Design an enzyme around this catalytic site. Structure first.
Site, mmCIF file in Angstrom:
data_model
loop_
_atom_site.group_PDB
_atom_site.id
_atom_site.type_symbol
_atom_site.label_atom_id
_atom_site.label_comp_id
_atom_site.label_asym_id
_atom_site.label_seq_id
_atom_site.Cartn_x
_atom_site.Cartn_y
_atom_site.Cartn_z
ATOM 1 C CG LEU A 43 -2.218 -14.431 -0.485
ATOM 2 C CD1 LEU A 43 -3.070 -14.047 0.182
ATOM 3 C CD2 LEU A 43 -2.955 -15.280 -1.831
ATOM 4 C CE1 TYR A 48 6.977 -6.936 5.815
ATOM 5 C CE2 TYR A 48 9.126 -7.010 7.034
ATOM 6 C CZ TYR A 48 7.162 -6.742 6.996
ATOM 7 O OH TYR A 48 6.889 -6.372 7.972
ATOM 8 C CB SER A 49 4.803 -10.636 2.256
ATOM 9 O OG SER A 49 5.068 -10.612 0.551
ATOM 10 C CG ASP A 154 3.991 1.207 3.764
ATOM 11 O OD1 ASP A 154 4.829 2.477 2.178
ATOM 12 O OD2 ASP A 154 4.305 0.061 3.075
HETATM 13 BR BR1 LIG Z 1 -4.140 -9.185 1.644
HETATM 14 C C1 LIG Z 1 -3.684 -8.034 2.623
HETATM 15 C C2 LIG Z 1 -2.067 -8.336 2.401
HETATM 16 C C3 LIG Z 1 -1.954 -7.118 3.956
HETATM 17 N N1 LIG Z 1 -0.598 -7.129 4.223
HETATM 18 N N2 LIG Z 1 -1.051 -6.227 5.472
HETATM 19 N N3 LIG Z 1 -1.893 -6.497 5.670
HETATM 20 C C4 LIG Z 1 -3.111 -6.651 5.137
HETATM 21 C C5 LIG Z 1 -4.517 -7.540 4.725
HETATM 22 C C6 LIG Z 1 -4.671 -8.258 3.157
HETATM 23 BR BR2 LIG Z 1 -6.435 -8.943 3.380
#
Ligand SMILES: Brc1cc2nn[nH]c2cc1Br
Ligand SMILES: Brc1cc2nn[nH]c2cc1Br
Length: 332
Positions: A43, A48-49, A154
């Site tokens: 996704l 960073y993610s 955040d």
């Molecule tokens: Br999409 C999503 C992104 C996130 N980043 N941190 N926690 C999360 C939970 C969901 Br659901």
């Protein structure tokens, strides 16, 4: 030295709970098996993610899997404990499971499924009513987590997942959230530049829940004025200058004197002196439909230098700006 501060609301809630509630370092995690899931796709959450859509093999249910970025495990247990504590709360994302990949041993959080439509993608195309609706929804999450002794830290459009067809909203990414304890001095290198509260920018450490309310103000300003971001700084120093040009410098220095803040030397030349600008300055033909007396009164009461002066989440929810929203909620 700096003058102490305490939260106006929910001040001692963690003190009155068992040690286990907030002592996240002592929390024992039962790690599940990441083999119960299969990742479908990555996704797009930024560089960073490491967030994925996935399927729980055991029941064919769609889920979201967040692979935790190598970090002090202190932070890992913190996010887990906060998620567990807030589970089932209004508009808080639901942690389904906690797992590890058997080979790599890397930790991962499994969440309830939501669409990857964050608020940033929708919040510049909204009607007047829908801005108030979703703001009120975000406020439910903030009041709950604050009532439960947790500040998010955040709060930004990118951390608000929205399903606009079913009118559903979830506050996400609790990886910077922390438990509020009266007297504790917190890290000021949290939040993203444009949503950083003045207390973060002047290195005032003894902040509280009201941090999230500043961030909410920045979001609101951005939506009603169609200006993204509203405070557009080059860096953390110029960020406070951007704020200064709107809120003015008189309330800034008054705030500094009240809490006896040792202002960083760099600030001295760059702040100058600026009047407090009337919000009318930001209204124009393309945003006038989103802007009302009620929106400006509400916005003004969120964006204060003095963190004590800002509306609490509950106070915000009872502001006239949300009267028609509250009315429609009782009707349904
Ligand atoms: Br999409 C999503 C992104 C996130 N980043 N941190 N926690 C999360 C939970 C969901 Br659901
Ligand atoms: Br399912 C799954 C597969 C993975 N490959 N590499 N890391 C992973 C994490 C999970 Br959860």
């Amino acid at each position: 030295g700096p003058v102490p501060s305490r939260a106006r609301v929910y001040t001692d809630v963690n003190t009155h709970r068992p040690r286990e509630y907030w002592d996240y370092e002592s929390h024992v995690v039962e790690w599940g098996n990441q083999d119960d899931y299969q990742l479908v796709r990555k996704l797009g959450r930024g560089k960073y993610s490491e967030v994925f859509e996935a399927i729980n093999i055991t029941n064919n249910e769609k889920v979201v899997v967040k692979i935790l970025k190598p970090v002090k495990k202190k932070k890992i247990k913190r996010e887990i404990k906060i998620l567990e504590n807030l589970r089932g709360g209004p508009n808080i994302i639901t942690l389904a499971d906690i797992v590890k990949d058997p080979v790599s041993r890397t930790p991962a959080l499994v969440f309830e499924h939501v669409n990857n439509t964050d608020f940033k993608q929708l919040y510049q195309t909204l009607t007047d009513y829908d801005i108030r609706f979703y703001m009120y929804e975000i406020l439910k999450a903030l009041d709950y987590c604050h009532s439960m002794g947790i500040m998010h830290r955040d709060v930004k459009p990118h951390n608000v997942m929205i399903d606009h067809e079913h009118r559903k909203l979830r506050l996400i990414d609790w990886g910077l959230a922390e438990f509020y304890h009266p007297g504790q001095e917190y890290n000021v290198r949290v939040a993203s530049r444009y949503f950083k509260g003045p207390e973060l920018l002047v290195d005032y450490q003894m902040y509280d829940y009201s941090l999230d309310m500043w961030s909410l103000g920045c979001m609101l300003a951005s939506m009603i004025f169609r200006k993204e971001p509203f405070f557009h700084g080059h860096d953390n120093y110029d960020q406070l200058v951007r704020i200064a040009k709107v809120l003015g410098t008189e309330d800034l220095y008054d705030y500094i004197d009240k809490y006896n803040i040792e202002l960083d030397p760099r600030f001295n030349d760059i702040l100058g002196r600026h009047s407090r600008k009337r919000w009318e300055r930001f209204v124009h033909s393309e945003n006038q439909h989103l802007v009302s007396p009620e929106a400006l009164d509400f916005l003004d009461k969120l964006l204060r230098y003095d963190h004590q002066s800002r509306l609490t989440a509950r106070e915000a929810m009872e502001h006239p700006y949300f009267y028609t929203v509250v009315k429609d909620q009782a009707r349904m």
